[PDB]
Amino acid sequence: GSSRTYGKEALRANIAAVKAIEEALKSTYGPRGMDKMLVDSLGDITITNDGATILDKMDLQHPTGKLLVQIAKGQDEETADGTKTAVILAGELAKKAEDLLYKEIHPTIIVSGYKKAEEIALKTIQEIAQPVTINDTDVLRKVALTSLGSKAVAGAREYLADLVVKAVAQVAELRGDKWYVDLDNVQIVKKHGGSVNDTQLVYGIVVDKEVGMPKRIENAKIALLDASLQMHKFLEEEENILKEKVDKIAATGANVVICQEVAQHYLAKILAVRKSDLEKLARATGGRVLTSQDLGYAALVEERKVGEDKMVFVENPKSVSILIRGGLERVVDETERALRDALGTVADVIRDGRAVAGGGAVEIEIAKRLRKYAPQVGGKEQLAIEAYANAIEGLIMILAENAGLDPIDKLMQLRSLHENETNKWYGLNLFTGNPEDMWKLGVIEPALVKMNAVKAATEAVTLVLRIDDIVAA
Amino acid sequence: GSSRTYGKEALRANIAAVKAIEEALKSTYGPRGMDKMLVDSLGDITITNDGATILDKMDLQHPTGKLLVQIAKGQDEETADGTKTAVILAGELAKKAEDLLYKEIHPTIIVSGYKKAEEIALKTIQEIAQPVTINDTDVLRKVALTSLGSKAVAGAREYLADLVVKAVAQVAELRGDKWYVDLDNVQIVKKHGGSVNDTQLVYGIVVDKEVGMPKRIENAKIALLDASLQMHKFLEEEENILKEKVDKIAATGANVVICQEVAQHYLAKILAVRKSDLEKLARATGGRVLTSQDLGYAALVEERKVGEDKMVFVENPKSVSILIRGGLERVVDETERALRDALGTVADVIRDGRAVAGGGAVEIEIAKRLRKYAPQVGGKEQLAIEAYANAIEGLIMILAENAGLDPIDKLMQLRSLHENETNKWYGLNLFTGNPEDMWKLGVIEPALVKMNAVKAATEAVTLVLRIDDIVAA
Ligand SMILES: Nc1ncnc2c1ncn2[C@@H]1O[C@H](COP(=O)(O)OP(=O)(O)O)[C@@H](O)[C@H]1O
Numbered sequence: 001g002s003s004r005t006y007g008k009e010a011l012r013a014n015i016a017a018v019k020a021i022e023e024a025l026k027s028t029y030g031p032r033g034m035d036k037m038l039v040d041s042l043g044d045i046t047i048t049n050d051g052a053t054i055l056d057k058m059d060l061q062h063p064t065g066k067l068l069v070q071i072a073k074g075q076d077e078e079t080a081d082g083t084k085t086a087v088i089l090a091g092e093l094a095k096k097a098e099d100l101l102y103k104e105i106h107p108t109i110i111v112s113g114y115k116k117a118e119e120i121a122l123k124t125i126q127e128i129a130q131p132v133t134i135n136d137t138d139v140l141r142k143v144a145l146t147s148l149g150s151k152a153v154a155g156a157r158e159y160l161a162d163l164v165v166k167a168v169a170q171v172a173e174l175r176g177d178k179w180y181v182d183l184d185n186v187q188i189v190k191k192h193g194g195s196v197n198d199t200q201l202v203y204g205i206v207v208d209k210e211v212g213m214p215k216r217i218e219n220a221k222i223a224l225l226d227a228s229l230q231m232h233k234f235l236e237e238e239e240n241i242l243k244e245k246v247d248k249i250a251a252t253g254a255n256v257v258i259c260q261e262v263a264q265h266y267l268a269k270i271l272a273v274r275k276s277d278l279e280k281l282a283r284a285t286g287g288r289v290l291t292s293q294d295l296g297y298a299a300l301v302e303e304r305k306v307g308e309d310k311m312v313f314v315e316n317p318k319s320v321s322i323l324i325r326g327g328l329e330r331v332v333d334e335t336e337r338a339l340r341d342a343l344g345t346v347a348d349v350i351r352d353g354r355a356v357a358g359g360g361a362v363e364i365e366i367a368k369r370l371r372k373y374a375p376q377v378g379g380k381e382q383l384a385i386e387a388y389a390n391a392i393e394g395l396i397m398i399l400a401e402n403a404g405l406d407p408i409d410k411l412m413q414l415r416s417l418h419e420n421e422t423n424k425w426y427g428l429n430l431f432t433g434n435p436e437d438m439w440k441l442g443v444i445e446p447a448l449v450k451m452n453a454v455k456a457a458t459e460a461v462t463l464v465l466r467i468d469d470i471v472a473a
Numbered sequence: 474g475s476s477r478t479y480g481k482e483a484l485r486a487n488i489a490a491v492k493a494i495e496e497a498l499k500s501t502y503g504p505r506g507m508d509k510m511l512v513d514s515l516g517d518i519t520i521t522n523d524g525a526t527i528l529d530k531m532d533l534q535h536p537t538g539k540l541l542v543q544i545a546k547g548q549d550e551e552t553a554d555g556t557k558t559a560v561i562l563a564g565e566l567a568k569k570a571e572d573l574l575y576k577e578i579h580p581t582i583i584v585s586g587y588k589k590a591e592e593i594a595l596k597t598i599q600e601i602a603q604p605v606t607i608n609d610t611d612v613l614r615k616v617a618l619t620s621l622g623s624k625a626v627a628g629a630r631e632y633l634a635d636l637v638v639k640a641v642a643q644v645a646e647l648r649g650d651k652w653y654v655d656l657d658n659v660q661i662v663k664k665h666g667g668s669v670n671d672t673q674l675v676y677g678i679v680v681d682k683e684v685g686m687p688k689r690i691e692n693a694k695i696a697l698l699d700a701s702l703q704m705h706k707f708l709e710e711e712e713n714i715l716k717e718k719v720d721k722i723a724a725t726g727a728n729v730v731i732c733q734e735v736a737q738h739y740l741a742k743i744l745a746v747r748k749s750d751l752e753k754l755a756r757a758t759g760g761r762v763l764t765s766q767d768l769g770y771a772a773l774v775e776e777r778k779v780g781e782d783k784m785v786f787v788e789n790p791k792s793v794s795i796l797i798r799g800g801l802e803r804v805v806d807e808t809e810r811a812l813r814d815a816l817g818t819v820a821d822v823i824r825d826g827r828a829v830a831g832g833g834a835v836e837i838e839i840a841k842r843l844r845k846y847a848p849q850v851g852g853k854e855q856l857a858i859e860a861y862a863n864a865i866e867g868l869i870m871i872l873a874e875n876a877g878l879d880p881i882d883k884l885m886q887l888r889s890l891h892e893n894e895t896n897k898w899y900g901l902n903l904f905t906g907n908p909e910d911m912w913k914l915g916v917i918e919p920a921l922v923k924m925n926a927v928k929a930a931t932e933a934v935t936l937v938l939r940i941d942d943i944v945a946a
């Protein structure tokens with residue numbers, strides 16, 4: 001038994017499927033605008049704005065929908081970013097294409113035009129950006145704040161934004177004549193019962209553990225250990241293995257002993273501390289997880305009180321800890337989704353070296369280049385590029401509607417202001433509800449995120465229009 | 474198989490759910506007004522006014538309702554207080570918002586206005602309060618009586634209210650330049666066959682247990698014990714362990730031995746008495762739960778007759794026992810729900826240092842600030858703040874209806890009296906049925922309870938209006 005889907009109706013089925021998952025996500029384009037909740041047959045409950053977190057658990061009848069979703073999920077695994085933009089832009093590209101099919105243009109022509117215009121967009125993004133460097137700290141703070149916002153505590157966390165910017169500046173280097181970073185150089189530590197005021201940067205490694213042993217050690221080495229630190233003859237051999245640590249490793253100054261009972265008395269009579277931490281310490285200290293070799297080095301080691309409880313510190317400088325003591329485990333959980341995402345957002349700026357506005361105004365400027373390229377092509381392909389420009393202009397029309405404005409009137413006012421070239425960066429403000437300068441408002445995005453969004457959208461819609469027939473076996 | 478809820482109809486479903494649990498609790502806003510009964514499929518029966526005790530056992534089809542209930546239950550776990558006010562205020566905020574949706578204001582705008590006004594309310598509460606201190610004993614007695622009332626025995630328990638106020642005054646200290654208390658410094662003891670006249674305060678620890686041993690001991694130490702107090706050689710070792718208590722612990726004066734058979738004769742030939750009590754004794758005496766160490770100290774120890782039967786007493790001064798000998802176990806059970814709740818109510822006053830009226834008049838005064846802030850904002854947001862003020866004015870309209878008055882007429886009369894600024898504290902009296910001075914009537918509430926009520930309500934209704942879509946998997 002085998003099942004088949006055919007002809008114009010196969011396009012109407014697959015276009016309907018992508019319009020359906022668009023409709024299921026259209027309202028949630030952020031940052032202000034309503035959110036969605038998902039519940040288990042076990043009776044469990046979740047509330048989220050985040051499309052990537054939604055598409056982790058959506059329900060998917062048509063295979064082409066599942067495949068488009070897979071492409072979006074891959075885009076998020078590369079970036080964590082743009083994930084809602086890609087699906088929405090794909091959805092509107094697909095719908096506006098349906099308006100051509102009544103004029104009976106053969107689908108391969110549309111797939112030509114929708115591919116060709118994407119060259120002009122991709123070129124135009126690389127034209128209009130401005131440069132940025134590690135030194136440009138207030139612009140980096142604007143970038144961090146734009147990634148951090150849509151939770152009111154982002155105003156209080158404005159000093160926490162400066163902490164991660166300086167942590168990046170210490171993590172950052174040059175490679176390929178470009179500023180160079182990755183996230184995994186930054187350590188984070190996390191305890192409850194604190195506040196935003198507890199938060200710190202360390203320029204070193206933090207050991208979030210509580211221990212006769214000394215509070216302070218200086219100019220010393222470090223021992224890293226996997227797991228913990230003839231009957232009578234073999235009994236004493238495992239006593240000797242303690243002093244065999246002293247005999248060479250203490251004689252060279254390894255004043256702290258870090259483990260994943262006789263030593264607890266003996267070393268107190270030297271500090272002992274109870275895999276990722278041992279890797280971070282191996283990166284910072286040069287140590288490795290007996291042998292007389294494998295030793296790490298540091299100038300300072302301490303245990304100190306940090307809010308409600310004690311913590312241990314080791315103080316290579318190219319890795320940096322930041323310290324969080326939040327009020328609750330709820331705050332730690334959301335501090336990943338805020339802070340590690342913000343750090344990654346900044347790193348993608350650092351590795352781009354260039355930046356663009358975000359007020360939808362990048363998109364409107366692309367629309368103005370497109371309507372000047374299309375008359376040069378002039379074939380039937382022209383109706384496809386004019387459609388593409390109108391469909392991407394169809395994005396901010398949605399974004400304004402989530403700010404409750406009447407969209408058409410604000411769209412025409414915006415385009416009228418943009419027509420005179422009055423600004424490079426006029427766009428649509430979601431709080432004042434007005435056409436405003438989006439750059440002085442401080443709303444910034446990396447150009448890479450636009451490129452990967454527009455790319456993933458065009459890839460998805462070609463994989464819809466290019467399919468004639470489905471068979472199942 | 475997956476289930477989905479959508480569009481305007483998802484709001485009408487979720488608004489209907491919160492209107493339903495409001496309707497299921499609307500009539501029970503206290504203190505005079507009808508109550509509700511809950512019965513098991515096992516045939517068991519309960520009668521209560523207390524919403525927190527009701528929401529311990531309600532039936533909950535919609536998840537958003539369950540989640541709003543969870544927020545109310547959390548509010549009660551923090552406070553035990555305000556629990557009905559939060560739900561009712563949320564319910565009316567939700568209903569009055571429905572009257573805007575026919576004018577097609579986008580829900581995000583309403584959520585803006587309902588958030589913005591809450592700043593003006595929160596500021597206004599902190600403006601109008603009056604200060605209070607430990608010294609202000611008759612005002613503290615009014616506070617206690619207002620927490621104690623709606624059981625007629627509160628008139629007889631007016632001296633019992635003075636006992637817990639003085640127990641607090643002995644428990645209380647300064648911390649952070651503020652008067653400081655917590656409940657867990659007060660011991661309570663509980664026997665049957667007595668009366669309100671049996672009740673006492675002790676400035677010490679009471680041991681509610683009946684024992685050749687002496688009736689009185691003075692200037693002595695205390696032994697606290699976990700659980701009770703080579704065959705022949707090890708037999709006698711457990712005889713020696715009795716005199717080993719004498720050999721150091723009696724030689725230093727530990728005349729009472731407190732346990733969670735040879736000693737019953739031997740010590741009579743010293744007092745022996747048969748986890749929370751041992752912790753309370755550890756707090757008062759400095760003792761700890763053989764060793765020669767761990768000893769407690771007190772100036773006086775006694776066993777004495779207390780109504781129907783004997784009781785033992787130990788007499789650090791910063792913990793205080795109060796003594797209850799009620800007529801029945803029914804009285805002890807309700808004496809938690811009265812007395813420990815009243816003590817907590819007072820402590821929340823002590824730690825606020827400030828106080829507000831309760832006659833609904835705090836709420837009406839907020840309504841008068843709001844209608845003067847709203848014309849400055851002036852956008853579409855104005856229709857949301859004017860609605861919020863009208864909806865919170867909608868609270869006392871219910872409270873008067875539980876006193877059987879015709880509500881509209883009393884509301885207009887009240888607002889007319891409040892308009893002229895005739896009083897800071899005119900409100901609505903539930904017994905005389907008249908507009909009266911609520912402060913001279915002695916009806917007092919802590920400002921914290923209002924803050925946490927208005928806060929939890931606004932949090933709940935935003936979590937309703939902010940949801941567009943539900944999916945179940
Ligand atoms: N506060 C803001 N003001 C204006 N535009 C914004 C704001 N926040 C985000 N945007 C725009 O919204 C789009 C990003 O959508 P968003 O849901 O934030 O994506 P993501 O969830 O991946 O961050 C871009 O056009 C971005 O510039």
Ligand SMILES: Nc1ncnc2c1ncn2[C@@H]1O[C@H](COP(=O)(O)OP(=O)(O)O)[C@@H](O)[C@H]1O
Nearest residue numbers: 502503504554555556557831832833903916918
């Ligand atoms: N005897 C009273 N006279 C006037 N208002 C009262 C009286 N008792 C309570 N109130 C008011 O009722 C509201 C408290 O509702 P209530 O059911 O008592 O809450 P709770 O059950 O948490 O004590 C507040 O407005 C409070 O001031």
